[PDB]
């Protein structure tokens, strides 16, 4: 939900709606904050996910540290799925 009810609604938006077209400018202010708002929580959410996986007793983990580079891969998948959002929104818009 927190990482894919956002990122399947961020890619569901429609920026330009239906001279006076300056209202569109005003309209495209509003939803901008929308995506920004949503993005922050996902940058929050994935982040919080890491803390959950780290802070836990598991007595057979206090001699084996968690690795790093695949957590950077989890982070990277989060980035690229943001990108897939925005390119879907832009292409639907231009259509």
């Amino acid at each position: 939900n927190r990482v894919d009810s956002n990122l399947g609604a961020i890619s569901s938006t429609l920026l330009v709606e239906l001279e006076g077209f300056v209202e569109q400018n005003r309209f495209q202010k509003k939803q901008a904050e929308l995506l920004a708002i949503r993005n922050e929580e996902v940058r929050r959410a994935i982040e919080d996910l890491y803390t959950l996986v780290r802070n836990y007793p598991r007595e057979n983990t206090e001699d084996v540290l968690d690795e790093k580079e695949v957590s950077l891969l989890v982070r990277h998948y989060s980035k690229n799925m943001y990108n897939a959002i925005m390119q879907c929104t832009l292409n639907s818009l231009q259509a």
Binding site: L34, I37, R38, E41
Partner: protein
């Protein structure tokens, strides 16, 4: 938000109209020898349309608890504190007290309440403390104690606490219970058809510091007692001073539900 740090949320109330998903929340710390040397508290209003940085922030002059709302409207909000000092806030200013209910003689004690009466075409309130003196305040015009009765037990140990009081789901002529924390639910009516002494019920039988009280809705009047680590269901008759559907003796001392 990352300011919601080192501050236990000791209530959450919900906004009363239908399709406004806002929540009013309420963050504190008791056992005040570890009163936090950092943040003086300020509660919040979040929305679910976006997990917005708190729409409005209410800044009190002391540790907000128990912060109920104003009934069925998108305007106004109450609060409690730790002095005894109630509070009151409107929505078109993200600031301190709109009308801070002042200090007068009696109520100088921590308040776990800001409970509304059905005073029609207006607004109203009452409180409760670890002194007893449940002390009604004014309506709309706010600064005076209306029916300021320090209540008293029949055999004169008037330091009788309370939490989480419940009213009537049948039109509400002032019949209510007070969740008295020493293990004995109390009850009242305020219209003393008798003399001023009108605390009928001590429902002794629940255990230790009680934390739950709620009438049941959707058909009837059976009230609940989820306060200590047994979760009962009680009933209101003068012959049934004992549960009905007692449920499990639990682990992990109970603290609250509905």
């Amino acid at each position: 938000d990352p300011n919601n740090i080192k501050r236990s949320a000791s209530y959450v109330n919900w906004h009363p109209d239908g399709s406004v998903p806002k929540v009013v929340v309420a963050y504190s710390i008791l056992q005040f020898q570890q009163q936090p040397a950092g943040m003086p508290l300020s509660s919040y209003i979040w929305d679910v349309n976006n997990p917005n940085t708190p729409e409005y922030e209410m800044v009190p002059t002391s540790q907000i608890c128990c912060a109920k709302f104003n009934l069925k409207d998108n305007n106004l909000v109450g609060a409690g504190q730790y002095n005894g000092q109630l509070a009151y806030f409107d929505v078109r200013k993200g600031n301190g007290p709109v009308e801070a209910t002042p200090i007068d003689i009696s109520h100088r004690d921590p308040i776990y309440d800001f409970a509304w009466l059905q005073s029609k075409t207006g607004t109203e309130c009452m409180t409760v403390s670890t002194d007893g003196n449940v002390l009604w305040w004014d309506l709309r015009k706010m600064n005076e104690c209306v029916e300021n009765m320090p209540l008293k037990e029949k055999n004169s140990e008037t330091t009788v606490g309370g939490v989480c009081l419940e009213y009537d789901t049948n039109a509400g002529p002032t019949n209510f219970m007070v969740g008295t924390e020493q293990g004995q639910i109390f009850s009242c009516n305020r219209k003393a058809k008798n003399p001023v002494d009108r605390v009928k019920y001590v429902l002794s039988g629940h255990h230790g510091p009680i934390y739950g009280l709620r009438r049941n809705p959707f058909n009837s009047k059976y009230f609940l007692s989820i306060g200590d680590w047994t979760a009962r269901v009680w009933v209101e008759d003068t012959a049934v001073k004992t549960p009905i559907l007692t449920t499990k003796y639990h682990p992990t001392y109970l603290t609250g539900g509905t």
